[PDB]
Paper text:
Class Ia ribonucleotide reductases (RNRs) are allosterically regulated by ATP and [name] to maintain the appropriate deoxyribonucleotide levels inside the cell for DNA biosynthesis and repair. The α2 subunit houses the active site and the allosteric sites, and the β2 subunit houses the di-iron-tyrosyl radical cofactor.3−6 On every round of turnover, these subunits come together to form an active α2β2 complex, which allows for the transfer of the radical species from β to α, affording ribonucleoside diphosphate reduction. Excess [name] inhibits RNR through the creation of an α–β interface that restricts the ability of β2 to obtain a position that is capable of radical transfer. ATP breaks the α–β interface, freeing β2 and restoring enzyme activity.
Residue numbers in the entry:
A (entry chain B): 4 to 736
B (entry chain A): 3 to 645, 649 to 736
Write the structure that this text describes.
Amino acid sequence: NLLVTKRDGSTERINLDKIHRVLDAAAEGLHNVSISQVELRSHIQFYDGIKTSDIHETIIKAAADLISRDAPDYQYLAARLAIFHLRKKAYGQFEPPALYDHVVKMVEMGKYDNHLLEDYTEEEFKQMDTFIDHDRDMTFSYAAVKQLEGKYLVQNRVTGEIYESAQFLYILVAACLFSNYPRETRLQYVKRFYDAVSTFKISLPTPIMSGVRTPTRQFSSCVLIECGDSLDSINATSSAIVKYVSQRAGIGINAGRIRALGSPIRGGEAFHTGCIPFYKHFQTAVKSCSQGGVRGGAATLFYPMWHLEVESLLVLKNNRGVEGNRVRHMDYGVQINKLMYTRLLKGEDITLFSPSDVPGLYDAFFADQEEFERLYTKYEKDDSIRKQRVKAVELFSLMMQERASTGRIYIQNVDHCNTHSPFDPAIAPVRQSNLCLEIALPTKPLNDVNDENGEIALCTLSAFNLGAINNLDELEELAILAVRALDALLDYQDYPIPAAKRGAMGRRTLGIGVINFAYYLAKHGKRYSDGSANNLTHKTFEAIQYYLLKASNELAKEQGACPWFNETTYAKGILPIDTYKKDLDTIANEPLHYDWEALRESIKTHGLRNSTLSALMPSETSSQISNATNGIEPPRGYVSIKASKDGILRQVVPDYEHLHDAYELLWEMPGNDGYLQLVGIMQKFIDQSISANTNYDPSRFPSGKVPMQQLLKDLLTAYKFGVKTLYYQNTRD
Amino acid sequence: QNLLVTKRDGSTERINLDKIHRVLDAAAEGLHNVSISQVELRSHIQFYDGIKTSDIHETIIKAAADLISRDAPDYQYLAARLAIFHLRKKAYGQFEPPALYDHVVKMVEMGKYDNHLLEDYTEEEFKQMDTFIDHDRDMTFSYAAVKQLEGKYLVQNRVTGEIYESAQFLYILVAACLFSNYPRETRLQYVKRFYDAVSTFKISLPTPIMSGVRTPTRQFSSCVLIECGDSLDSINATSSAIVKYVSQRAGIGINAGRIRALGSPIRGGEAFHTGCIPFYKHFQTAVKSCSQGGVRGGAATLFYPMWHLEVESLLVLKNNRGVEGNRVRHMDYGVQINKLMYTRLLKGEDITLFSPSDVPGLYDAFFADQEEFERLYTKYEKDDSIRKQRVKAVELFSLMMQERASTGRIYIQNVDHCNTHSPFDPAIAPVRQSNLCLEIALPTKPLNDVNDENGEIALCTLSAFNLGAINNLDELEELAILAVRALDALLDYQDYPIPAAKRGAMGRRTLGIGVINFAYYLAKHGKRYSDGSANNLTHKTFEAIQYYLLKASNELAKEQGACPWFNETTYAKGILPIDTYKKDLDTIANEPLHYDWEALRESIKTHGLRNSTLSALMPSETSSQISNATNGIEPPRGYVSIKDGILRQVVPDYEHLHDAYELLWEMPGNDGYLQLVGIMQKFIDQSISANTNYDPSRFPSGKVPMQQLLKDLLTAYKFGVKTLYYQNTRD
Ligand SMILES: Nc1ncnc2c1ncn2[C@@H]1O[C@H](COP(=O)(O)OP(=O)(O)OP(=O)(O)O)[C@@H](O)[C@H]1O
Ligand SMILES: Nc1ncnc2c1ncn2[C@@H]1O[C@H](COP(=O)(O)OP(=O)(O)OP(=O)(O)O)[C@@H](O)[C@H]1O
Ligand SMILES: Nc1ncnc2c1ncn2[C@@H]1O[C@H](COP(=O)(O)OP(=O)(O)OP(=O)(O)O)[C@@H](O)[C@H]1O
Ligand SMILES: Nc1ncnc2c1ncn2[C@@H]1O[C@H](COP(=O)(O)OP(=O)(O)OP(=O)(O)O)[C@@H](O)[C@H]1O
Ligand SMILES: Nc1ncnc2c1ncn2[C@@H]1O[C@H](COP(=O)(O)OP(=O)(O)OP(=O)(O)O)[C@@H](O)[C@H]1O
Ligand SMILES: Nc1ncnc2c1ncn2[C@@H]1O[C@H](COP(=O)(O)OP(=O)(O)OP(=O)(O)O)[C@@H](O)[C@H]1O
Ligand SMILES: Nc1ccn([C@@H]2O[C@H](COP(=O)(O)OP(=O)(O)O)[C@@H](O)[C@H]2O)c(=O)n1
Ligand SMILES: Nc1ccn([C@@H]2O[C@H](COP(=O)(O)OP(=O)(O)O)[C@@H](O)[C@H]2O)c(=O)n1
Ligand SMILES: [Mg+2]
Ligand SMILES: [Mg+2]
Ligand SMILES: [Mg+2]
Ligand SMILES: [Mg+2]
């Protein structure tokens, strides 16, 4: 005699057969799943007059809780049930409308960009509708669908109303990005690109997934802003942060130029009150807005190791201090070079300077290591220059201690970023990184928010799904599609800050990485830790960079090289294979299989459409769409528990049934050596950097505490193999 | 063995107590009831072998300063002169200052003085200005004055600590700079007259003028008012202007009430608005990012309407019982209230809260049109389609007064009073905010960029009349001419880092001239604050002040032209403050107008005013110490006030007036004080930094009841009080 409340507000007798019908449809083709089990977990929570939507959410939750090693197919059962509900939420029915009718209505509501109706005819929308396979929504895993409804699908962030479905997302991303292409080839690209992303061969980032089709055009994930030593630059930097955080971007801030506490201002008219009060101002700029209504804003701030306030800056995330000297809600990257490590190894002292007191030292730190060492030792001997001496061991230990405590103190090897780089340090040095330490681009400080002479670096991302290819030669066509889409995006999107448009239009920097690398190694029967994957990694990432360059080179023939191509090492006929750190020759003997010399000349002759092409991002969120292992990281477990706005999610490794023994889980590794070696080998070909993690299990160490010696050893090992940056440090609980 | 001292050059010589004694005799000349032996004994015991001669001098300064008392007040002059002696050595290497011209040349060469001085004046003119100077006026400072001189005002290295000048050089060059664009026929006559006025303490100058005017950095406006719009572009523009102006000696008043509430849709729902508090935090770090020109810390007051949707969250931002996520403690706040809000309180009704983005026209009418506000308010209160929240008026007001009592830093602005009794036409240029210390009330316009030419930032330049230095009220005629001319010339002389600020300054040319030594003034007339015995005297006094201020600015309009936007003032329509004051004042004062305001009215309507505003009563907490004045209109805490460390300051003429003063905690309540404020406000163009005071021990169970807090609040409104500054609670 129990009643349920329908969508129209009316009530009718409960019908358990209707629910069974829906469960049957979602369980089609699945193995080792039980409808009864979901029913048992669901029926008990029903009550008189329960809303029909609350019933649907109950059975989704019930199926999601049953995701396990014994029955992994619950990941599709839970996903499909969620898909069913999302259809009702968006369309009021299961079957999606015609694409054209959908677009017209959505443009009328102001949810889609007007250009869609201007750039495509009704005939073309009907033709694009034939490209769409809505049954591909039944190929998602549960974690994927939660990211879709939570972040990616176009929706009202106040109401919660869903406006679209996954395949409309995919086709309109493709339609918008190729909207400026000639009608002779346009739809052919739209279809090819739609297939590539909807069948998970190419992975798209969050701001593209949630942005490309909306009236707000900003799809770059990474924004790099260099701050100058003036109030005008600090104000400009702060404004650019607020504007770009609110428009879907994560921020990298370089504030190393700012003079130290106690420095004179205007000849001594003022006493400099320090960097920390300005860091706080950058922090509130980041936390002032949400990231385009999708997630919270975040930033990583960079400063040199030899900065005079470095001992104060290193403990900014430490919870044991007053608010006066704590800036906890930002991450930090300490910038290091060969000389600093040398002082550590020789057990010597490091001299701290304010960049305002040492002419030329800051610039040489990134561009010229010989000049740096000349100026550094010269200023160390100058009594007239304000300075402070610290033991290198104590300084490094403090850094690694804070890195261990928080996990969010990062390292950037600035010499590696410039000796092995797509840029000439004498023309455009790399002086910072981004939020997740995989981006390395040239920048220039601003004197105003609208300063035409400043440069903010933008990087637009994507990733190759290494688990979705049978041969490395598939990367060629995939690279062409990826490069063309991201490069066309640069002309398509808008730029709230003029200095950012400068860097984007001048360099056209792309950052394309990989996902499902752990799955990839598992299929080849290799491991992270023992070194069995060294040569396979070398072979694999050679193919990736080669086809990326080849695609960008061909696109230069068609549309012209980027305006500032002559500032690259590529322009001088220098390739990544020429400048890598030679210690890599001791850990890999895989030969080059592709014709780089023919490629070298073609680049030297026609140039590149893009100054950078590769960067290995963590893909923490975006990789969940294809149920991939994120980036290059090994999974935590066969069934991982990840975070979400709704609650906890269970995510299964791809093909657990056949590869349960093939995977090497994160905490099954003896140490970081094997991992750091793979990262170094990757870096040989990667244009920018890699979001490299370090991992430590306290229980594997005596007295349950990781010795400082081990931390410093892995740090030096990373530098030895040319690793440019270090991201998270994970400490097991 | 013999005890040695270390000289300045690093050498040593046998200690000579006679040298110290001789220095003490020079500083004690003409003083009474002081003992050199007392100072020497306290100093000698702290001496040690090889003691630096400069540490010797600092010791005898401390010794004299510790003997400052009611019994022997002249130690305040003993300690000061000793401090002046030492400051001479630091700046010149000797007691006697160099010739003015040689000093200026060297300081310009060192980059400590502005280049224009050597361009605008000849060597002959500097030698002539040197004849105006009386360096012996340095011996007329009190100790607190000299501590502010060496600490904040004298040109010095903020990293080194090196002093570069003395007080009379400060005074002569402030005058020389401000009148530097004057015709040579009258220029040096203005320089001498103005130098005499400030060095003999007739006119009091504010901190950024005292520490700024002669330096290469030209920004001397004390108050900067920035209105923020509901957009990121405006928020970014506001943040930039704050950082720039704090760094250049200014205090900030922020209007952030237009910002839509937490939960509001953005771009039709593309985003969820995360609230005002994260932006308030961004403003706080902007204020605290810089020092104020190297002199003191940055500070700001932020303003919002009482009917804002987040008002309950905004009111507790200084409350120390919360996580950092919803606490912005290092800023002050001004709650904006009007008649309709008070009515709901008195009637025991509800107040409806809105986000200004959801109530078209309500925010503007809140300041400009009380009739239209009530129409829109009641209309929107019944609209179900409009997001809203209802709160009992009693509970909302109690929360506000609770946080005001706990912190002392939650302020009140009666926005209707600020626009019905104003030099500005609310239909053209409404007053929508105040400043840091709640005495400034000027028009603003939000910016869309830091370089936006269509925005308006309000700047106010300050000064004060020393009421304890005048013999008759007609001496204000001369002093007003000097004060107005100096501040008006300053506007063309100084620079403007933000274009929107230059717009308001050049367009309205708003000045804020107040008073100091008011407590000393009442004491000389045998009046008190509390009983109402000074109501008519206050009326008579502040009538003369505003009249002579308007008259000075009216004459200045004839000579140089009225301000560009004079047409936006009530003065332009022939309306005077004596026409628009709150009528309840007629019940607490029957003093007639002694000056010809009708003749002035005709003159203003014809020739205009050089300045849109002229009067504002600032607290003058720092600047008043220079003349050893009682600060502003506030009564002293004691005969010896304790304000490097601790300072002792004696009220002027303690010997003859110890019985005439009425100390702060000798008062029954705030009624007598609030009536004086209301009477003052009748003539004041802008507002007054009005304090409320409470002694818990006078109340049952040692706690001031909310009913009493609300009574004083309503009393202030009753008498047309525009703003409320500090609430002081006795310990
Ligand atoms: N009478 C019912 N008794 C039990 N479950 C029901 C009943 N009607 C619908 N459900 C279940 O509720 C869930 C949500 O279905 P649905 O979104 O179609 O709700 P609805 O009220 O039927 O909507 P509409 O009337 O627009 O079709 C489904 O799992 C469906 O099987
Ligand atoms: N052909 C289908 N294949 C898969 N899922 C479907 C199909 N048709 C409908 N669904 C989904 O199943 C759920 C229930 O659909 P539907 O409203 O038709 O049934 P019901 O609500 O149980 O019954 P009714 O609403 O007619 O009382 C919805 O979430 C809908 O999107
Ligand atoms: N009042 C202040 N308080 C604290 N820091 C300040 C202040 N003014 C400027 N700074 C800092 O001093 C540095 C220089 O400031 P800025 O360049 O804008 O002024 P400037 O006139 O060029 O002086 P300088 O010639 O010394 O550089 C910057 O790091 C800025 O943040
Ligand atoms: N991502 C964001 N997170 C939080 N607050 C935001 C964000 N973007 C904008 N805001 C706030 O929303 C308000 C409106 O923003 P703004 O005017 O700059 O953008 P807009 O495109 O004009 O949007 P709208 O048309 O809704 O006004 C401002 O108060 C601003 O601070
Ligand atoms: N030999 C001394 N013994 C004791 N007190 C002294 C001696 N010389 C100076 N003083 C006192 O020290 C204080 C500081 O005086 P002053 O600045 O002139 O020091 P100084 O070393 O004598 O400098 P300078 O050489 O420039 O005259 C004064 O009170 C002075 O009387
Ligand atoms: N004529 C004066 N009137 C008042 N104070 C003076 C006079 N001459 C000097 N002083 C002050 O007295 C202090 C001491 O002056 P001065 O250096 O000449 O004497 P001293 O330090 O005691 O002895 P010494 O000759 O060893 O320096 C200084 O602070 C100086 O400014
Ligand atoms: N929570 C996050 C995650 C990523 N990012 C940005 O996205 C870049 C790559 O991160 P990612 O590949 O994990 O991001 P997703 O696109 O996978 O969400 C980083 O450099 C950040 O700039 C961010 O701003 N905020
Ligand atoms: N600590 C202070 C005090 C005052 N002020 C500014 O000075 C104005 C009047 O204060 P005041 O007259 O007490 O300042 P002084 O000139 O006496 O130092 C206020 O409106 C503030 O804008 C400031 O910026 N910082
Ligand atoms: Mg139904
Ligand atoms: Mg500078
Ligand atoms: Mg001496
Ligand atoms: Mg807007």
